[PDB]
Structures are given as C-alpha cells and as structure tokens.
Amino acid sequence: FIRREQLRIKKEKDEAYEKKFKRIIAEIQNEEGRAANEYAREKAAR
Amino acid sequence: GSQLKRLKASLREQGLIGPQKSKKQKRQNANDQKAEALKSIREQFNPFQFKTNARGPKFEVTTNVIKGRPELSRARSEEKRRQTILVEMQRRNKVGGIIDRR
Amino acid sequence: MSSLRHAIQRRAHKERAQPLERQRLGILEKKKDYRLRARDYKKKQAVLKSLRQKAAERNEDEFYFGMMSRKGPGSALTRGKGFTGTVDGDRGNKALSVETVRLLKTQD
Amino acid sequence: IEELIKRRILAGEFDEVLRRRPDMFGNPHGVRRGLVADEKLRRDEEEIKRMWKEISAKLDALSSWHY
Amino acid sequence: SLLPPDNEVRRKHETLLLDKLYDMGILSTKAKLSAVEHNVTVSAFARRRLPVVMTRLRMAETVQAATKLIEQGHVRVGVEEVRDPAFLVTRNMEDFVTWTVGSKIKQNIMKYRDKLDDF
Amino acid sequence: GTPWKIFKNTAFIKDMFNSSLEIAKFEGAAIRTVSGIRGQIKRALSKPEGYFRATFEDKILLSDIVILKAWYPVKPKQFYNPATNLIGWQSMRLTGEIRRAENIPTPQNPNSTYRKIERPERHFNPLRVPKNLAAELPFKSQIVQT
Amino acid sequence: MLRKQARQRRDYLYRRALLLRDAEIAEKRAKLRAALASGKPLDPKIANDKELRKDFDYDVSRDIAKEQGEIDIDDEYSELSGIVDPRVLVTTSRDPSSRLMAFSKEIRLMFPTAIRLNRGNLILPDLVMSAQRERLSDIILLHEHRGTPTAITISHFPHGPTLMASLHNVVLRADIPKSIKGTVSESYPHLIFEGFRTPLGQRVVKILKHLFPPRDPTNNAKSGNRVITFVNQDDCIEVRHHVYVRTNYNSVELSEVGPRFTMRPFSITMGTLENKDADVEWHLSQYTRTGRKKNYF
RNA sequence: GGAGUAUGGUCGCAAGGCUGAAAAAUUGACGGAAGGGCACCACCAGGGGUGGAGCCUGCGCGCGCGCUACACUGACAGAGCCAGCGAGUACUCCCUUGGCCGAGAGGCCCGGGUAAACUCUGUCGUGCUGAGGAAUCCCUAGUAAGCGCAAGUCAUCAGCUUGCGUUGAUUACGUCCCUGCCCUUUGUACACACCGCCCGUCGCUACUACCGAU
C-alpha cells in the first residue's frame, strides 16, 4: 500500500510542478520581452 | 450442462426472459420472491467473485459453498490501510493533538 | 560563467577506497570501471549475435574453392576429443620430400 | 469492467474483425456463380486492360509460370 | 499515371502491376509507381537471371563459376534440370533452386563438411 | 549489503539485514550498488536468515558494495540556556574542548579516510565462441586458428 | 520450405526499412496534395523539389486510398486476415502440474479454434519447426510458479511477434465445483477493446484480435452470446470474458465464465518464439528514470 | 515584414432547477421435435496425480500446487560402459579457539562445527531395520511416468522456475447411446443424384365489426 500511495504522490507532484513552472516562465518572458521590444522600437526611432 | 443453458433455464423459471406473454396471461399472473432470487442468481453465476475448494470436505461429518470473499477482503483491507497508514504518512511530523478524558 | 566559481567551489572530490576488511576480494568497481566492463561485454555480445544470424541463415549447399583446399571442422563424431570447430590450416611445414632430406642429413 | 461490458453489449459495437469476402478485389460486387468525354475515358481504360493482358502473358511466360 | 487519381480501375491496375512485379523478382517495393518509373531495370532482369541468383544465394562464388557450372548442368530447379543460362527465377523459386541428383559439386560440399556418405 | 551469489542478472545479498520480516517491509524497493546499477529488491530469501534477492542490470561483481538509499527523519533537541551574564551562567562546553578535557579521541574510521588507489591497467579476456557455432557457421566466416 | 519462410522473413524486414525511408520522404509528399486542395502556400523548398513533383504525379493515389482507409498496410498480419480460421495451439513448459494443465485446458476452451498439446520431453526449436510444418497461426506457452500460472507468450507465426507477458491475479476454473460452474459454451465470441489509444496500443490490439475466428459479418450485433473484453489502465491489460443473456433491449444479463487475467506485457519481440536474435520492438522498461511513471499504451 | 509552429496570459459562449437516489418493430420474444458434426470439461479401455504422515510458498486454523519418507523394486562390494544445454578479468558454505609476522588498520598457518541410469559378477536373506479411502481431476505417439546435468534471460521464479539430454511403454485411436456443446429446418454456384412445403405460443402491422361512457 505504501508503494502505490507514494508513487501516486510522485506522479501528481511532478505534474503540478512542471505546470507551475511553465506558467511562471511564460508569463515572465512575455512581460520582460514585451517591454524589451518596446524599448527596441523606441531607441530604434532615433 | 452449460452456464449459458442453466442460467437461461433459471431465468425462465423466474419467467423474466421467456416468450412474449398475453394480456389475459398477465391477468392470470395478477390473479395468482423475484428480487432476492435474482440476487442469488447473480451470486451463483458470477462465481469468480470468490474462491472455493473443488473437493468438498475431506471427511463428511453430519451435525445440525463460500469459504471466503477475496474482493471484500481486498476492499476492507484497503479501507483499514488507508484510514491508518495514509494519515500516518500525512501527519509524519505533526506535533500537537487533543487529549480528551471524559 | 567560468569565473563565477570559487576555488574551494571547484575543489572536487576524491574516490573512496576499498575497505580494508575486504581487500582480498578485489578492487572496487566504481563508475568508470563499470563503463569499461560494459562496453567490452557489449561489443562482444553484438559480435556473437551477428554470428548467430549467420549460422541460422547458412545455406547447406554453398560451394567455394576453399572447400577444395582446407580441412573441415566437422564434429566430435569424426574428430574426437580434440575438436573445436576451427578450420585448421598448415602451421607452415609440409611433407618435405626425400632428396632434400638427404641434403639436410649430409649437412648435419 | 462489468458495466463497460454491459455498456458495449447494450450499444453493441464490436472492434473484432469480420470475415471479409475471400476475393474482394476482382469480385467486389459478387453475383452468384449461377443462373441469371467519359467515353474517351472508357476507351482508354479498355486499352489499359489490353496492355495489361499483353504484359501479363509476356511477363509470366517470360518467367516460366511460377506466379 | 495518365489515368485520373480517383479511378477505381486505376488503383486496381496499380496493385496489379506492383503485385505481379513484386512476385516476379524485379522490384523491391509494392507501393510506388515512382519505383516503377525509374527503378525497373534491365540490370534488374539481369539480376534475376539464374546465374546471378545462384551467386547471391551463394551456390558458387562469382558468375563465372556459376555460368560454367550451369553449362555443364549441375543445378536442378525443383525437379527439372537446367541447360540454358537465362532461366528467369521468380522470388517463389529462389528457394527451391538446388543442386542436381548426385553431382560432384554436391560431393564437394559434403566431402568438406564431412557428411560424405556414398549412398 | 554484500553479494552472496551472483547469477547473471539477479543476485542474492548477504550481510545487510537480519530478518525477512524487515525485508518484507522492504519489498519491491530500490537499490543502487556503487558502480551505477539501478535495481529492484524483489523478495526475501528463505533459508539464510538475512539474505535477499534483487534484480540488477548486469551482474554486480563479487567485489561490490550493495547499498540502499534510505532517508531517515530527524528531530533536533530541546535544550535551551539563556545566558544570564549579569547573574552568572553555565555554558555547555565545546566538543573539542570535551575530548581535550577528559582525554578521549576524536574518532575516525580507516575505512572512511580517503586514500588513493592503485588500479591495474584493465585489459580483458579474448572473445570466446561456442563450439556449436564453430561447427555450424557458414564458410566465408569460418574461423581459422591453427 | 524452411528456406522460403526464412527468405520471406528477411524480405519483410527489407520492405520495412524501405518503408522507413520512403515514409520520411512521403512526409514531404503529403504536404503537397492538400496544399493543392486548399491553395495555401507551402515551403518553397518542397515546392522546388523536382523528383518530388515527378514521383508525386506518379504516386498520389496510394496516399488517397490511405486517407480512404481502403488499403491494408504491411505487417506480419494483414496478408490473410478474414480468411483462415486461425488455428491456435497451447502447451506449457517442460513438466506441467495439475492446475496448470487444467488452466491451459481452459484457455484452449477460451480461444475457440484452439487445440491443446502436451509437451512431455520435447525440444523448443523443434516445436517451433513442427508448428511451422503444420502451418499454424499461433502458439502459446504458459508457465507456472507453484500450481499457479505466470507468463503467457502470445506468439504469432509465420514470423510475427512474441508478446511475452507476466500474468497477475489469476484464478482458474477448476476450483469452483462442477455443479456450480458449467461446461463451457464454445461459440465464436465477440471481442471488445477498452482504452487502447497509442499506436503501440493498437499494435497489441492487432496481435490479440487475430487470435479470434472471423465473426460472420451479417448480424454481428444480435447473434452470439459470448464476448471477450480486454481493457487497460496503468499499462495493465486485463481480460474478463462473459456469456451474456439478453432479457430486454434495456437490460442484458452477464455471466462471468472465462478466467480472470490481468497481464502486463513486457516484451513484443518482432521475431518469433525462440529466436534470441530478436528485434526488440518494445519492452516494459523498468529501471530507467521516469519509465516507472510514464505510460505507453 | 510574410508564412507556419508552438507556449501560457486576457475576454465571450458553453454556466439558469416543472425538480427532489433506487424503446423500436411487417424483421420482435421464447421454446419443443426430427437431421448431422464434435469432445478426454462425453461414453468404452487404461494410466497417473492430489487427497494418508510431514515440510512449506501461495490462496481464505482451512485449503491445493510441489517436495520428501515409506522393503524386494534389497543391500554391499568390485568390474564395464554413453549424452545435451554450458564461458563477463567471472564464480567463493559459514563463523569462530590458538599461534606467526605485523608501534597500529590486516595477512598467513592449524584446527572446531568429465551424468543419473544400465549391464555383469560375487556376499547376505524380510528384520518400528509397510505407496495414501470417499472423493475428484488429468491424459491417445516421442503422448505418461522415472532419472538426472546445466542456465538462472528487466517482467514472475530460488521454499524454486526454466531449459536439454537419457530410458521409453499399456490402452483406445470406434462412437454420437449418456452428459453435453455446436449447427442444421434461411439465404450461399448449375450436373448426372436424392428429397419434398417441421411445430408451438404468441407479438407487431392492415382490415372488419363490437362495447359503452363524455
């Protein structure tokens, strides 16, 4: 019983894990690169 | 005999499966059980719910067949193993409880 | 980077020797020695497997010219105690005929 | 298990193979062995069947009839 | 190829040609009209003449030994003998090629592997 | 642990436990001998009271050290001394000071102390081919060794 | 004969590797046809591929029939599918025990044109050559631990796969007394596959499905009182085989008759039974890192 | 900038409770009697387990599946004679008294706890020195039993599992009479040939007329 429970816990944990981090990485990349390309267009204007 | 044939016969003895009867026939039946008998039917005819010795008794004593239920044992053992071991694993290191004398 | 690492940071580790309650049974196969034993076993077993494909896909009526000029392996049946299925050859020396032998004898 | 068995036999649909008719190709329609422009396309297909019979004989009787 | 692609009789001729050639011994696939288009080969017919197929099936060594051998006639094909070194060999027959009733080539084989039994 | 007998892929292990009760706690579990072989503890072994059966990738050698990675939970203590420096206070001493104080050595294990090793330049046996194969195999690849 | 089977084996492998190369090419080919169909632009390389265009105009239509589902792909199986009532034999390991031989008997009775043999003291490659000499279409070795079954080897001739699979959670016929159980109803059953969704899944589905006689295609739904059910969760192929009686069109009454297997399959060797020169098509990979967690099937 | 290919953020819809767990059908439903085929879950002939004592895995103190003991099938002694799987710098039965050499960690030394079978020849003569009932289950040509020797194949298996060689039988090898199971009484290719419209209860559909309320 320990075996089936522990390993089910590992599975659920890893799924939540990689989901959480791909969320945060995508949001952060979008924001920082968003304003970065904005600064690119602004400096490129002059 | 076959499982198929014996079960068809039995459910015909109950009358659940037979030919299409008539209106006056249903009148006669209303003129003149089934649930617990069908419980026994499904019990008898899904017999790989459980385990049985094929011999019978080694000695026949008279003084006045299911010797077990594997699925029920796995079920109840699952319930007990959950209600103890899982909550131990979840409160591995939990300090503090309520002590109640009454 | 590669100057974002301190000196004691790159100070890496040192293997742990065989315990000296045991050493009469052989050195301790750590990782690299395991890899070596693996790759040897691997290339040998794949050689063995390819040979097995050949020996299950022989044809009995091949024909060459070697078979007109070598011995054959055969079996224990005709060869005896002393049979691996090697095809022998010569070792180098032949039936050296009489006249030259006389010449040898005179010289000796 | 038991309910999905029940489910499939109820809405009875079976993944299992059926007996295909043994020679579906040349006899796709299958009448009994018993008593009974698009025209340019048809001319072309007739000529193709011609060339096919030609090549059939030529090939098989090139290879001595083991085919 | 000229036929339109939706034609049932076209697909039937496709499978026809590919099945008959794949059981002939020229081709390699059973799927590509392209393979018919620039794979079919007089060297493929040459590769299916009975000299080279006994070479690949490893009767003799090369096609000299094979061809001379067949001229003096040592290769049965199933039951018949062989005189005429262009007996084309289909994929079905490339197994039942073998040596004749008792020849010295058979006895070369058997004298070497030491199963030589004069009976 | 320590290997007792070593068949090809499975293996027995000797001096690790005492009781197959403990092994039947340790069923189905994970075991990673030094070299790099992940593997599985399957099932207790009957007659030697302390031996147990695993399955590994390739044979662990007889000279290996079978380990079991366990993670054991621990508990700090509950001692606490406020330092009453305006009253006077007892400090618990330093442990180097303790061994200096009552003349007891700073322990060590000669098995534990790092050393360098002197390996040999590892060569191998030649290939061997079974004599079945030696008498069956086709011509052009028939082995020739005088 | 053995020649011509072995030559067909290697031929089939050669066509497979050719299928690999031409499939990688045809990945570029298929992109054209629908692009012609929808007029949308493509990658200009694939556009400016000359041999692709020539070979395209020659060989569109087989891809069309692929889309249609008309054609029968190459494998071990799809030569003679709904023609030969596939003969299946069973034989256990070297020295069977009582319960084992009874369970092999039962599984002979579960697959319906199955004949049983007893193995005695008889040699494994000669069993294979003899079954090949009778032109079978199956072979099933079933091993035992201590009066209980272990491992089924659904191997399928002339040169297809051997699914060697451990069984778990098996209980037989011959424990339940002959009064309660009945003699088996031997009819050509139906077959129902629950949950298979990966291409490896359908590969295993194929090698199970051709262990069954081709049900006559007229009234497949109504006739037949016998069904067999394979179903998987956590890669675990589990089978229950039930004779039903159908009291209504809103209620059907089952009867558990065939045994209870839950097999986990650990190898599909693309090579027949003994052939230790095996082309390992798949295996249960323990021992790797996330091969415990992730799911095939 | 165009084209795809993704990754997650944002918004709309799906996301309003006449509610309160437990058919279709001209084809449909169930049977029965005749006719064949089949079957070691059938007959007939035979064999052989398990089930007796013990060991013990597994399954739920019980249980079977294996293994072992059980006396003429004797012992002991000599002599004589044949196999198949078999090769990873690799495999070890422990744990201890002493002593050696080791300022110390050890290593030594001595103790304690390429078959089985078969055949032949002689020496003895049944002696706590007893081959598993009812029951059941299996089995028809290299099939059953007996014997060993090996390997330990990711999964299962050492309380064993699996290979492979050796010695190789009785008794059937007919039959559908018991129990059965399947399927014929539709369709499915035509000859010379033969047979000659099974049966039941109902259902459903069309029509006929009735009955009586409102």
Coordinates of C-alpha atoms (C1' of nucleotides) in Angstrom, one line a residue, chain D residues 32-35, chain H residues 187-190:
Chain D
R32 CA -23.6 -15.8 -57.5
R33 CA -22.0 -18.3 -59.9
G34 CA -25.4 -19.3 -61.0
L35 CA -28.2 -18.8 -63.5
Chain H
rG187 C1' -30.0 -17.2 -47.7
rU188 C1' -24.5 -19.2 -50.2
rA189 C1' -22.6 -21.9 -58.0
rC190 C1' -26.0 -25.4 -62.2

